[PDB]
Every structure is written in C-alpha cells, then in structure tokens.
C-alpha cells in the first residue's frame, strides 16, 4: 500500500520587521500526512530552534518532494522519540523499501509497534539511501544475496470478494451458501 506519510519541504522565515529587515529563510523537510501537519511541525521546529512563532512568520512554500522511481533500496532512517521514562532516545535503523516516504512510514510503524511511540513524539533526523555494503544488520543484508530465493509457505489466500463463500463442498469448489 502507498505510504501514509508524504515528504514535504516547508520553506519559511520570520516576518520582516524594522528590527530584522531581512530575516533568514529556513528550509525544513518533514514527513506528514498532509500539508497542515507539515506546517505545524515546521512552526514547532522554528519555535524550538529559532524562537520564531507562527504568529510572526511566513511560509514561502509547502511542497511535496516527489519520490524517485521505485527501486529496492536500503534506507537509513536516523530517528528519535520521546518517552517520560527515558527522555529522548535516538536510534539509527535500516529498512528495505522502494521510497523515502515508504521507508519513513515503515519506521513510524516500527517505532509504534516496538516502542509504543506516536507520531508527535517522533522526530526524523535524517533519511538516506545507502549502498548494500554499508548495511550492518543481517536482517537487511540477507536481501542483498544475488540468488535470494524463498517459497511462499503458510499462505492464507482468500478468494476474490465476489467469489467468497460461507459453505463450500469439502473437496470441491462448489459453494453451497454464497
């Protein structure tokens, strides 16, 4: 399925004033479900790093950075999350995916499952596509084998939604209730 997060580039600045006639323009990249959340994360970052509130700032552009062509790649996601018990925990994780947005969405699902971290407690520091020989975890490197083969065992294959049946003959495809 397509990723639930998009790659946004928010460009903004503090509103020009007499005291600061030409404010610095900042480029910020974020992964958010929509552009309103992207602007929210941008203004949070501006507040916590530059002391610039949204009430005194401009957003020059909020565009989606398009994905590249889908290619099986190794993505390095440097990511951090907050918990009351531990504070800020930074980790660097490698993922197999076809896009940066897919890799980051997978990272968010992974943090939500293995550490119970939610979107607004998570900061993606960086996402980079790395070569095969820079992959350190065997759980990812096993997909670099040239003769990578495996069967599909324990498949749970459901019929086409129209063809699905409640009662079917035991050694037969004849549907009795459908």
């Amino acid at each position: 399925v397509k990723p639930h997060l998009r790659h946004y580039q928010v460009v903004g600045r503090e509103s020009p004033s007499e005291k600061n006639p030409e404010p610095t323009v900042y480029k910020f990249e974020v992964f958010a479900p929509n552009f309103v959340v992207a602007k929210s994360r941008f203004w949070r970052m501006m507040r916590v790093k530059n002391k610039v509130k949204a009430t005194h700032g401009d957003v020059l552009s909020c565009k989606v950075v398009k994905d590249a062509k889908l290619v099986a790649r190794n993505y390095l996601v440097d990511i951090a999350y907050y918990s009351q018990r531990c504070g800020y925990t930074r980790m660097v994780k490698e993922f197999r995916d076809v896009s940066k947005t897919g890799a980051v969405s997978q990272a968010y699902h992974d943090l939500a499952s293995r550490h119970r971290a939610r979107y607004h407690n998570i900061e993606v520091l960086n996402v980079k596509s790395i070569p095969d020989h820079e992959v350190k975890h065997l759980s990812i490197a096993q997909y670099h084998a040239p003769n990578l083969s495996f069967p599909l065992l324990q498949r749970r294959t459901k019929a086409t939604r129209k063809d699905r049946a409640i009662f079917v003959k035991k050694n037969t495809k004849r549907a009795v209730v459908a």
Partner: protein, 186 residues
C-alpha cells in the same frame, strides 16, 4: 526474521533416510527407526545422490530456529542407533544392604534396596533388551541395549528413579542405581 536457516547432515553409506510429511524413517543394518516430527513445521529434504539430509526453516525468529539443530540431533541419533546401537550400563551402588536385581526376560525386580521389603518392578519395552552382566566380570551391572537412544535412556532413567532414597539425607546414603557408561553395541 531470517529468510533461510539451514542445517545439513551427512549420511553413511549403509543408512537410508526417507522423509514424508515431517515423518522421518531411518533404515540401517540393525533395524529401522521412525520419528514423528509433525509438531515442528520445518522443510525436511533428503538428497539421495549426495547422501545428505537437510532441514530448512523459512522466515523464522529465534524460537523456530532452535528446532533445526534439535531435528538434526534426532536424525543423527537415529542413524547412530540404526548402525551402531545404544548400550547403557548402570551400576548398583550401596553402602550396607546389597541391592539384588533380577532380570527375567523384560522384567526387572529390585530387592533389598536400603534393606526394604518392598519389591520394585520395571517392565522394559520390547525394543530395549535388558541383560545382567556376570558378577565375576563386573559386580552389580545391568545393561540396556536398543536402537532408540530415547527409549534406552528412558529405561535407564526409570530404573534410576525406582531406587531414590526417601526421608533421609541425600549427601549421605548414596545408595542407588546409576548409569555409568553410555556407549554403542557395535
């Protein structure tokens, strides 16, 4: 998870290994053995031309992988027991009361264990042959012979646990029946 975990086993020339639906049958010069491994969910493969046995787990975490070497060990035990057999030799150790052991066919009677009047009786299954060494060679030695390691070791264990000391210090009162040597028939 790991995509492919693999264990390989070599087969001696005489042995014949066949797998069918996680059931392994091993045939050697001294009989045949069977193992029901349908509780494992592994990919068992036998290469007859290259005389190799292979067990594969696909997409496994730590718990399923731990079953690979267990399967290899079971099949290796079957091969060894079907080509050499298993011989467990137990000894009767006593301080004062001589433990008297009678082996009439498949029945083992233990008498006078710590001077008790109760008779401990064991019915060895037909796949395990129990004999008693001549006391001139080794005194108080009972031998279990079989092709199945698990059956022979279970018989030796149940004989060991029929003669546990109750309601006494166990550091003292070292009387009991203990397996001493675990070797092969051939």
């Amino acid at each position: 998870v790991k995509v492919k975990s693999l264990c390989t086993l070599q087969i001696p020339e005489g042995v014949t290994v066949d797998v069918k639906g996680r059931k392994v049958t091993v045939t050697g010069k001294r009989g045949t053995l069977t193992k029901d491994l349908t509780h494992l969910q592994l990919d068992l493969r036998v290469d007859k031309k290259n005389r190799t046995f292979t067990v594969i787990r696909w997409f496994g975490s730590k718990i399923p992988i731990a079953c690979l070497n267990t399967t290899k060990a079971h099949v290796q035990n079957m091969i060894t027991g079907v080509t050499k057999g298993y011989r467990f030799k137990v000894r009767c150790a006593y301080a004062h009361f001589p433990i008297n052991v009678s082996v009439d066919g498949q029945n083992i009677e233990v008498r006078n264990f710590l001077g008790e009047k109760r008779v401990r009786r064991q019915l060895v299954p037909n796949t395990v042959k129990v004999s008693q060494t001549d006391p001139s060679k080794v005194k108080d030695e009972i031998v279990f012979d079989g092709n199945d390691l698990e059956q022979v070791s279970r018989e030796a264990a149940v004989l060991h646990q029929m003669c546990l000391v109750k309601k006494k210090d166990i550091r003292k009162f070292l009387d009991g029946i203990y397996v001493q040597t675990k070797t092969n028939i051939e």
